[PDB]
Ligand binder design. Structure first.
Ligand SMILES: CCCCCCCCCCCCCCCCCC(=O)OC[C@H](COP(=O)([O-])OCC(O)COP(=O)([O-])OC[C@@H](COC(=O)CCCCCCCCCCCCCCCCC)OC(=O)CCCCCCCCCCCCCCCCC)OC(=O)CCCCCCCCCCCCCCCCC
Ligand SMILES: CCCCCCCCCCCCCCCCCC(=O)OC[C@H](COP(=O)([O-])OCC(O)COP(=O)([O-])OC[C@@H](COC(=O)CCCCCCCCCCCCCCCCC)OC(=O)CCCCCCCCCCCCCCCCC)OC(=O)CCCCCCCCCCCCCCCCC
Ligand SMILES: CCCCCCCCCCCCCCCCCC(=O)OC[C@H](COP(=O)([O-])OCC(O)COP(=O)([O-])OC[C@@H](COC(=O)CCCCCCCCCCCCCCCCC)OC(=O)CCCCCCCCCCCCCCCCC)OC(=O)CCCCCCCCCCCCCCCCC
Ligand SMILES: CCCCCCCCCCCCCCCCCC(=O)OC[C@H](COP(=O)([O-])OCC(O)COP(=O)([O-])OC[C@@H](COC(=O)CCCCCCCCCCCCCCCCC)OC(=O)CCCCCCCCCCCCCCCCC)OC(=O)CCCCCCCCCCCCCCCCC
Ligand SMILES: CCCCCCCCCCCCCCCCCC(=O)OC[C@H](COP(=O)([O-])OCC(O)COP(=O)([O-])OC[C@@H](COC(=O)CCCCCCCCCCCCCCCCC)OC(=O)CCCCCCCCCCCCCCCCC)OC(=O)CCCCCCCCCCCCCCCCC
Ligand SMILES: CCCCCCCC/C=C/CCCCCCCC(=O)OC[C@H](COP(=O)(O)OCCN)OC(=O)CCCCCCC/C=C/CCCCCCCC
Ligand SMILES: CCCCCCCC/C=C\CCCCCCCC(=O)OC[C@H](COP(=O)(O)OCCN)OC(=O)CCCCCCC/C=C/CCCCCCCC
Ligand SMILES: [Zn+2]
Lengths: 226, 73, 49, 122, 230, 186, 93, 152, 100, 141
């Protein structure tokens, strides 16, 4: 959005040093129990393991393929929640302009709390009046006393929590078959042989599964001076 | 801002420098460089000094020589 | 059309595996771009390729 | 094509140059790259004004939820005990300042003979 | 989500800085003033530290806010010089026929103009490198040499001048206008001594501020040169 | 007071038990001395680039801003749980430790002074060097000047070497040390 | 390692040629007693000892020298005056 | 002399003794002359930007010796400034309401002399020295000191 | 890339303003009829006549102005006691011979 | 350009109101739905209708403004842009050249003439017996 700053390096990818060292437990943790860093590497390890196995991709369904990459299939409930999140984020640093609100189609006022301050400026052209500020509280259909425009508060709330991208994923995404470490090893040997490492996340991941510092060059990779 | 094309019409490359062989005359090179980097900076930069210099040095004729030959007393 | 054409983030590659642009103070290595174009090939030429 | 070490061989002439020219070219190249630029590298790295601004500030965690000290703590105290100690040190000077300031008032009051208001007319 | 602004609740530099200011008034020795000035320099640096730490908020409007603040400061500096020009030209009718020796129009003006122009070219090259994400070590030391010559020339000029501040309002205005420019040159030394390469580059307000300020000082001298020397 | 003060260390185990973090150094993870790492890696000592050794000690700062990012947990040395929670901190460091904390809080100010003093010393040397010398003969008698206006007023431009020698002799006569000095011939 | 945007042109991992024992931090894991920093070797914190020591020495030298000048040398307008401000040798006053 | 090169090549070679011309005509030589940290960003530069930067840099450095020559001449001029007639104290000249003490509020050195009136201070320092009070300056002949810019 | 000011604003409003100031001044002079001939000299008639006499050789060269007035202030009386124009001319004559 | 402007010279964030002209209109287009045909009455409002990311063009504008920040190579501007970026630098450099090679010679000539003739070559000689150089800028007399 216009009010966001420049993308950071982390916004694109995370450094391998942030990979959890207990990969065996990472790939067995349920999604609801994975933190931001743990979830990132679970998807990247599992997602790249399927993408780096060309012979199996054509026979894999889109549902399975999306699951492996960690992408959430869209449905009306999830789409509704995500849409209102982005609208809330956009309105943080953007103007609030839309069609005139009526009983059939009230003006939607997204909020996290139970209250949000709103102003009515009437209709277009001559129908526009001076700003009339009011406190839009949940559970009331508000009617402007001057132009009779109808406002309503929409709350981004769910089970003692407010809607977030992670909350939507946890609520609707369902963990599939447990990731098999044999696939990690099989793909690792495919792209990493005789000192050539074209699949580096798997090379680190496989090394962690074998303990730490077992594969060639990994001891030197993990030794730091400061 | 009005979009407009690049006015540079001179050579775009002289080729690899090989001990200064097959390269244009020096004066032509100076002209090409100013064309490449823009004459507008040259005129703007030199305009102030040219105006001041001409005004001061014109007094050699306007103020000194003419006055001696034009004094009705 | 932003930042004079310089991207905020871009990939740089080095030929020597043990090269560090911050530790070494040598003067022979030439960094490459994401496509692998060596740095001494100017972008107005490499972008045409 | 033969590649020479950078900055050691001229491309302007086919003749490399005479002994004095070669000595000047090689040694200036060395002095710039390995002697003069020590000073610049030392100032840029060891004495960076902006690095010194973040000295003592906690590392930024990759996990977004572990950096809440950014808004939980005011920036003036991001430095932990160092920032608090700096604040506490100046606090100790409050009463020394009052005595110092009070002395100046006494100095001016005396120099203007305002203490002799009653003795003047007695 | 998050709040648009990360509020700053408490601050204690304001009290310290204000007390430091009061110490100037309540001094009984000029030595205390010298040491007091160091305290002011230290605490102002801490305030600059807070500005750098605010980068962690990732607020897009922070750069814009500081840039426009500098614009206002620049205007105040210009208007301060205007008042000195106002003072100088008010008594214009009393100049040029009093038995004092006004400055020559050949030596001082030319070398100073040449010297200050080089200063602008150095800063321009710094800006160009900042655009290209590049650095040149020697540039800073050229500024120091430039500032060294300026200090050396101005010191000699004041010492060898045969007229004094009390001789005429003309002399007072000459000395005062030249001093005011020098102070702004010295303020430039205060700013430029910390010039370094920062890897967050074009979101650093310091670079644009230095370029604007150095340009202002040089253009002001052109006005001074026309008024006094030419 | 606390163990950390008695035995200062950077990024060891049992930081919470030791009771305090005495080092402002943040980051690390470089494979080689002076190599690319994480964090900003700033400290009073053992950082930057050694001028004496001509070698890099730590890599260029890795800012948490757009140009960089966070530091991996493997190399985090200032745990905010121990860095903050300043309740009882003065007893954990004692009076001397309190003094050290105050000094280290002003690293930012110290860096500026190191980069600011030297040019001032240069300017000060100009004043000191000139103040030692006797002042130049600023003025002379009003009538005597005009009776020899051409020589005095234009002498410098026509022959500055002889004019300089003439000035020196006048200064020697003015301050009464002509017999004590031998002015070189021109 | 540094930023993720800098990589070798040929991705190659050296096959260990030496037999040096692995440093402890190279095989260390996160532990309850060391939630952070387990990947970096422990280092002495010299700044905690050197900063206050150096500061005290400079202050002592600064103050001691100032006191000595104002006591051993004769009265003068400034420090430079007290050192070089005396009349020429042999000039009786 | 060397006959293995043309006269123009010889002149260009010596002007290139510091490598300026070589770096101008070779992108590779220029980027390798950068330190490794900044060489990382060199790939994005256009040739127009690279050569334009050198042109601005070379013009600045080449002009520095000229400014130094002017400054040296200025220092020599000030070092031997001709004496000027003593000013006649006119109607509004040399007016004083109080002594000059803003430089030394407590010590009040040279209260009668103006802040930068060197000759007045010299005679005032001499009085203080004659009163057994040291003062620094104005004692060494100008021609017997370094950096005076007054030697024959 | 969007422009806020005139494309050549700096030169336009500097030279343009100077041109308008100069042309306005000439118009003002014409309306009021002010003489525009420049004289770099003082207009004291008696003094200019004395200077012409010196040029003609009627008054000896290097003769001070206070040597020619009918009223002298105290400072001039001090200078007249040490004034020797004849000696000054001889000294200048000696210098010319040495130079040539 | 030096100065930062949110609208045009926005180098702090790189935001651009419109996408590049390279993309076909089908792929991406400027966010303009002013010409939308009247909505049929039988259509029902499902979304908010509020200007924001629900509109496809605005969503793509926001997405592109974030994902454009990483690119494999430079997007080389034309020489006109490069000239404008350093217009002040180049002009100040030429101003320095003018001072050295134009102002310097005639200023030196005037001082030499002044030495011999007591006044600058661009000044009327005086007959009033006053000594000294006199004015320098003759047209300001
Ligand atoms: C057979 C030999 C003949 C030699 C003839 C004389 C030639 C002398 C040239 C001196 C030029 C100095 C220019 C100063 C400005 C700053 C330059 C600069 O940017 O440097 C960057 C350069 C590298 O910076 P960087 O950041 O690493 O790289 C930035 C770029 O990326 C990369 O930067 P870059 O590589 O592009 O830099 C290009 C260039 C940019 O500058 C120029 O090209 C400007 C050139 C101007 C020419 C000035 C000539 C002056 C001569 C006057 C003589 C008058 C005689 C009068 C006689 C009177 C008789 C009555 O900069 C230099 O090359 C600067 C000089 C480097 C020398 C450093 C070593 C110490 C000094 C050695 C002097 C040796 C003299 C030998 C004499 C022998 C004679 C037979 O800086 C340094 O090397 C470090 C600082 C030292 C540099 C200045 C040294 C001054 C030496 C003066 C010598 C002449 C004295 C004459 C006295 C006369 C008294 C009467
Ligand atoms: C071969 C190798 C050879 C190597 C040789 C190496 C030699 C090294 C030597 C080192 C020693 C140097 C000693 C001298 C240093 C200068 C000291 C000095 O006088 O400074 C002031 C000096 C003038 O002073 P002065 O006239 O000499 O002294 C007169 C006396 O003060 C007469 O006294 P007065 O009564 O007239 O003064 C009034 C009184 C007024 O007094 C009062 O008002 C107070 C009286 C009652 C107080 C009683 C207590 C009650 C409570 C008071 C509470 C106060 C605070 C309240 C709140 C705030 C408001 C006040 O003022 C004071 O007390 C003054 C001091 C006030 C305190 C200022 C802060 C100082 C702190 C310094 C240390 C840092 C903090 C340490 C913390 C430690 C923690 C563990 O000014 C300058 O220096 C001006 C020039 C600027 C600096 C130039 C630097 C030039 C450097 C040249 C370098 C050459 C390099 C050559 C290289 C060659 C290569 C070949
Ligand atoms: C205020 C007064 C005026 C002051 C003006 C100040 C001007 C300063 C300008 C500074 C410019 C620096 C130029 C550096 C050139 C570097 C090339 C060079 O010469 O290298 C030679 C050579 C290179 O050897 P190599 O590299 O082994 O070459 C062997 C190859 O196989 C063979 O390869 P190659 O053939 O290429 O190598 C040789 C080649 C190398 O050279 C070239 O080919 C040059 C090519 C590049 C040229 C680019 C331009 C250079 C800058 C020109 C600056 C012009 C300044 C104009 C000043 C006018 C002032 C009015 O040719 C030369 O060696 C020719 C050199 C030409 C020198 C011209 C000197 C003119 C002096 C004029 C004096 C006027 C006085 C008027 C007084 C009036 C009084 C009323 O080594 C040296 O540089 C030798 C250094 C040792 C010199 C010792 C000098 C001893 C002097 C004793 C004096 C005793 C006095 C006693 C008095 C007693 C009184 C009672
Ligand atoms: C005769 C021979 C001798 C001549 C001697 C001459 C002496 C001159 C002395 C000047 C001293 C130096 C001052 C400037 C230093 C910085 C130079 C610099 O960096 O320039 C290059 C650089 C070029 O920028 P760029 O973006 O690269 O432009 C690229 C292209 O040029 C194309 O750019 P673009 O066209 O696309 O536009 C982008 C750029 C274009 O802008 C510029 O580039 C600015 C260039 C200015 C250069 C100086 C020329 C002289 C200006 C005279 C103004 C007089 C004001 C009226 C006075 C009335 C008196 C009664 O926009 C900005 O940068 C915006 C800057 C913020 C402007 C804020 C203005 C606030 C005041 C507004 C007026 C207030 C009164 C309202 C009255 C009506 C009420 C109903 O300029 C800047 O970036 C500087 C901006 C920051 C400093 C602004 C200072 C504003 C001061 C406002 C004072 C208001 C006082 C109001 C009350 C007065 C009466 C009581
Ligand atoms: C039968 C009888 C026959 C008789 C025949 C008689 C013949 C008579 C012949 C007379 C000929 C008359 C000709 C008249 C027509 C002229 C036509 C013409 O071309 O006009 C336009 C022409 C040029 O205007 P233009 O076309 O707009 O310029 C094009 C530009 O390229 C526009 O492009 P741009 O805008 O992109 O330009 C670059 C611009 C781009 O801008 C940017 O990049 C953006 C930023 C701009 C704002 C900058 C803010 C500040 C920057 C900070 C940096 C400062 C660095 C310097 C620091 C110095 C420190 C000391 O940047 C700059 O230019 C500024 C930055 C460069 C450095 C600035 C230096 C300071 C300037 C201010 C002070 C000036 C006074 C200095 C005085 C000396 C020193 C005290 O105007 C003039 O030349 C003026 C006319 C002068 C008329 C004089 C008339 C009287 C004299 C008569 C002499 C002959 C008489 C002889 C006797 C005859 C008796 C019979
Ligand atoms: C077949 C036809 C060939 C025609 C050839 C024509 C050749 C004409 C050559 C003209 C040369 C003129 C040189 C003038 C140099 C004056 C230098 C000078 O005064 O230096 C002093 C001054 C500084 O002195 P200060 O004491 O500080 O005093 C001023 C400030 N207080 O320094 C300067 O002026 C430095 C600037 C140098 C200017 C050099 C100008 C050179 C002009 C060359 C013109 C060549 C034209 C060629 C035409 C060819 C046609 C076929
Ligand atoms: C490590 C040490 C480093 C030292 C060197 C580097 C740092 C330099 C810092 C910048 C110094 C700037 C100095 C500015 C003041 C210059 C004073 C000056 O020159 O004044 C004289 C000059 C001309 O005078 P004449 O002698 O008559 O000239 C005749 C020529 N023969 O102008 C004046 O007289 C005006 C003086 C104005 C001084 C203003 C400076 C501020 C002083 C404030 C004092 C306040 C005291 C009261 C208590 C409050 C304390 C804050
Ligand atoms: Zn309404």
């Amino acid at each position: 959005y216009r009010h966001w700053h420049r993308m950071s390096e982390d916004d694109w990818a995370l450094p391998l040093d942030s990979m959890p060292e207990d990969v065996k437990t990472l790939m067995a943790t349920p999604q609801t129990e994975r933190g931001f860093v743990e979830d990132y590497w679970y998807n990247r390890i599992r997602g790249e393991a399927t993408l780096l196995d060309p012979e199996a991709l054509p026979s894999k369904s889109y549902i399975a393929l999306a699951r492996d990459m960690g992408l959430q299939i869209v449905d009306e409930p999830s789409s509704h929640m995500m849409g209102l999140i982005e609208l809330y984020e956009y309105l943080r640093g953007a103007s609030f302009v839309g069609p005139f609100g009526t009983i059939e189609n009230p003006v939607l006022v997204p909020a996290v709390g139970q209250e949000r301050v709103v102003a009515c400026t009437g209709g277009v052209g001559d129908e526009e009046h001076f700003t009339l500020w009011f406190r839009c509280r949940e559970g009331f259909m508000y009617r402007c006393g001057e132009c009779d425009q109808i406002f309503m508060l929409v709350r981004l709330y769910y089970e003692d929590r407010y809607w977030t991208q992670t909350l939507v994923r946890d609520t609707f995404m369902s963990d599939g078959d447990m990731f098999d470490l044999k696939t990690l090893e099989r793909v690792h040997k495919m792209w990493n042989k005789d000192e050539m490492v074209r699949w580096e996340v798997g090379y680190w991941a496989q090394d962690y599964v074998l303990g730490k510092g077992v594969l060639p060059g990994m001891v030197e990779e993990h030794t730091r001076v400061n | 801002h009005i979009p407009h094309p690049v006015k540079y019409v001179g050579p775009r490359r002289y080729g690899r420098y090989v001990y200064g062989m097959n390269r244009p005359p020096v004066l032509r090179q100076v002209k090409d460089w100013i064309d490449w980097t823009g004459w507008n900076s040259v005129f703007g930069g030199f305009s102030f000094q040219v105006a001041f210099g001409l005004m001061i040095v014109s007094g050699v004729y306007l103020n000194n020589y003419r006055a001696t030959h034009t004094l009705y007393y | 059309a932003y930042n004079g054409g310089y991207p905020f983030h871009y990939v740089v590659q080095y030929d020597d595996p043990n090269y560090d642009c911050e530790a070494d103070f040598e003067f022979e290595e030439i960094p490459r771009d994401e496509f692998g174009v060596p740095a001494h090939i100017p972008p107005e030429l490499s972008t045409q390729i | 094509v033969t590649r020479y070490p950078s900055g050691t061989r001229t491309i302007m002439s086919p003749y490399p140059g005479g002994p004095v020219y070669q000595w000047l070219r090689i040694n200036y190249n060395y002095f710039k790259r390995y002697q003069w630029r020590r000073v610049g590298r030392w100032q840029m790295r060891s004495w960076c004004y902006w690095k010194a601004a973040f000295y003592g500030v906690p590392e930024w965690n990759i996990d977004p939820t572990k950096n809440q000290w950014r808004w939980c703590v005011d920036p003036a105290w991001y430095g932990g005990m160092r920032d608090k100690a700096n604040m506490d040190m100046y606090r100790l000077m409050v009463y020394p300042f009052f005595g110092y300031a009070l002395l100046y008032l006494h100095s001016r009051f005396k120099q203007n003979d305002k203490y002799n208001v009653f003795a003047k007319w007695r | 989500f998050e709040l648009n602004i990360n509020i700053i609740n408490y601050n204690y530099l304001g009290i310290i800085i204000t007390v430091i200011i009061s110490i100037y008034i309540y001094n009984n020795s000029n030595i205390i003033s010298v040491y007091n000035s160091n305290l002011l320099l230290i605490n102002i640096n801490i305030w600059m530290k807070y500005n750098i730490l605010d980068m962690l908020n990732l607020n897009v409007l922070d750069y814009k806010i500081l840039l426009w603040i500098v614009v206002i400061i620049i205007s105040n500096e210009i208007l301060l010089f205007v008042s000195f020009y106002w003072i100088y030209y008010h008594n214009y009718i009393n100049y040029y026929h009093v038995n004092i020796l006004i400055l020559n129009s050949y030596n001082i003006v030319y070398n100073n103009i040449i010297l200050l122009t080089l200063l602008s070219t150095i800063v321009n090259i710094k800006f160009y490198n900042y655009i290209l994400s590049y650095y040149k070590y020697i540039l800073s030391y050229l500024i120091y040499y430039n500032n060294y010559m300026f200090n050396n020339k101005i010191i000699l000029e004041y010492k060898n001048n045969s007229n004094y501040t009390n001789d005429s309002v003309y002399m007072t205005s000459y000395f005062y206008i030249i001093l005011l420019h020098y102070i702004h040159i010295y303020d430039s030394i205060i700013l430029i001594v910390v010039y370094n390469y920062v890897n967050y580059k074009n979101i650093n307000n310091y670079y644009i501020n230095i370029n604007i300020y150095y340009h202002l000082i040089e253009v002001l001298y052109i006005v001074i040169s026309i008024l006094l020397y030419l | 007071g606390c163990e950390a003060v008695k035995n200062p260390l950077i990024g060891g185990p049992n930081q919470k038990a030791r009771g305090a973090i005495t080092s402002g150094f943040a980051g690390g993870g470089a494979k080689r001395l002076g190599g690319k790492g994480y964090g900003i890696m700033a400290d009073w000592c053992d950082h930057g680039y050694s001028f004496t050794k001509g070698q890099a000690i730590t890599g260029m700062p890795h800012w948490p801003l757009w140009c960089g990012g966070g530091v991996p947990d493997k190399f985090i040395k200032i745990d905010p749980d121990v860095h903050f929670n300043l309740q009882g901190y003065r007893e954990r460091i004692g009076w001397y430790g309190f003094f050290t904390a105050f000094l280290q809080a002003n690293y930012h100010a110290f860096v500026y002074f190191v980069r600011f003093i030297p040019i001032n010393i240069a300017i000060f040397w100009i004043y000191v060097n000139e103040r030692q010398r006797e002042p130049q003969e600023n003025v002379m008698d009003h009538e005597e000047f005009f009776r020899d206006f051409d020589s005095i007023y234009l002498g410098q431009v026509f022959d500055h070497h002889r004019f300089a020698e003439w000035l020196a002799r006048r200064r020697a006569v003015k301050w009464g040390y002509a017999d004590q000095i031998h002015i070189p011939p021109v | 390692r540094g930023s993720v945007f800098q990589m070798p042109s040929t991705p190659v991992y050296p096959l260990t040629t030496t037999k040096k024992v692995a440093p402890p931090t190279a095989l260390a894991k996160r532990t309850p007693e060391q939630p952070f920093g387990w990947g970096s070797p422990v280092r002495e914190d010299r700044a905690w000892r050197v900063v206050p020591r150096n500061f005290i020495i400079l202050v002592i030298v600064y103050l001691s020298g100032w006191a000595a000048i104002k006591t051993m040398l004769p009265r003068g307008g400034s420090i430079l005056g007290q050192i070089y401000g005396g009349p020429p040798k042999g000039r009786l006053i | 002399i060397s006959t293995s090169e043309t006269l123009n090549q010889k002149i260009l070679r010596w002007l290139d003794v510091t490598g300026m011309l070589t770096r101008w005509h070779s992108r590779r030589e220029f980027i390798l002359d950068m330190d490794p940290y900044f060489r990382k960003n060199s790939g994005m530069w256009t040739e127009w930007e690279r050569k334009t930067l050198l042109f601005l840099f070379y013009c600045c450095t080449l002009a520095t010796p000229y400014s130094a020559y002017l400054d040296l001449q200025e220092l020599k001029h000030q070092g031997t400034k001709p004496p000027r007639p003593v000013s006649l104290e006119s109607r509004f000249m040399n007016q004083r309401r109080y002594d000059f003490t803003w430089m030394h509020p407590q010590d009040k050195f040279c209260s009668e002399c103006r802040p930068v009136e060197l000759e007045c201070k010299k005679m005032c320092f001499d009085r203080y020295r004659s009163m057994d009070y040291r003062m620094y300056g104005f004692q060494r002949p100008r021609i017997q000191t370094y950096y005076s810019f007054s030697t024959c | 890339g969007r422009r806020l000011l005139h494309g050549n604003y700096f030169t336009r409003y500097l030279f343009g303003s100077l041109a308008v100031i100069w042309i306005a001044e000439y118009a003002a002079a014409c309306q009021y009829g002010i003489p525009r001939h420049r004289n770099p000299n003082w207009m004291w008639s008696w003094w200019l006549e004395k200077q012409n006499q010196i040029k003609n050789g009627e008054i000896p060269a290097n003769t001070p102005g206070y040597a020619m007035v009918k009223w002298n202030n105290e400072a001039e009386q001090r200078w007249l006691k040490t004034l020797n124009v004849e000696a000054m001319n001889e000294e200048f004559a000696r210098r010319r011979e040495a130079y040539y | 350009k030096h100065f930062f402007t949110d609208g045009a010279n926005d180098y702090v964030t790189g935001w651009e109101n419109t996408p590049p002209l390279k993309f076909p209109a089908s792929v991406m287009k400027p966010c303009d739905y002013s010409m939308t045909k009247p909505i049929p009455k039988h259509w029902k409002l499902r979304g908010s209708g509020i200007h924001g990311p629900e509109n496809t063009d605005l969503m793509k504008l926001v997405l592109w403004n974030r994902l454009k920040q990483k690119r494999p190579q430079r997007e080389v501007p034309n020489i006109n842009y490069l000239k404008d970026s350093i217009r002040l630098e180049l002009s100040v450099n030429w101003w320095l050249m003018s001072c050295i090679f134009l102002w310097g010679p005639w200023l030196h000539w005037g001082q030499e003439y002044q030495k011999v003739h007591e006044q600058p070559p661009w000044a009327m000689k005086r007959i009033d017996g006053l000594r000294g150089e006199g004015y320098f800028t003759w047209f300001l007399e």
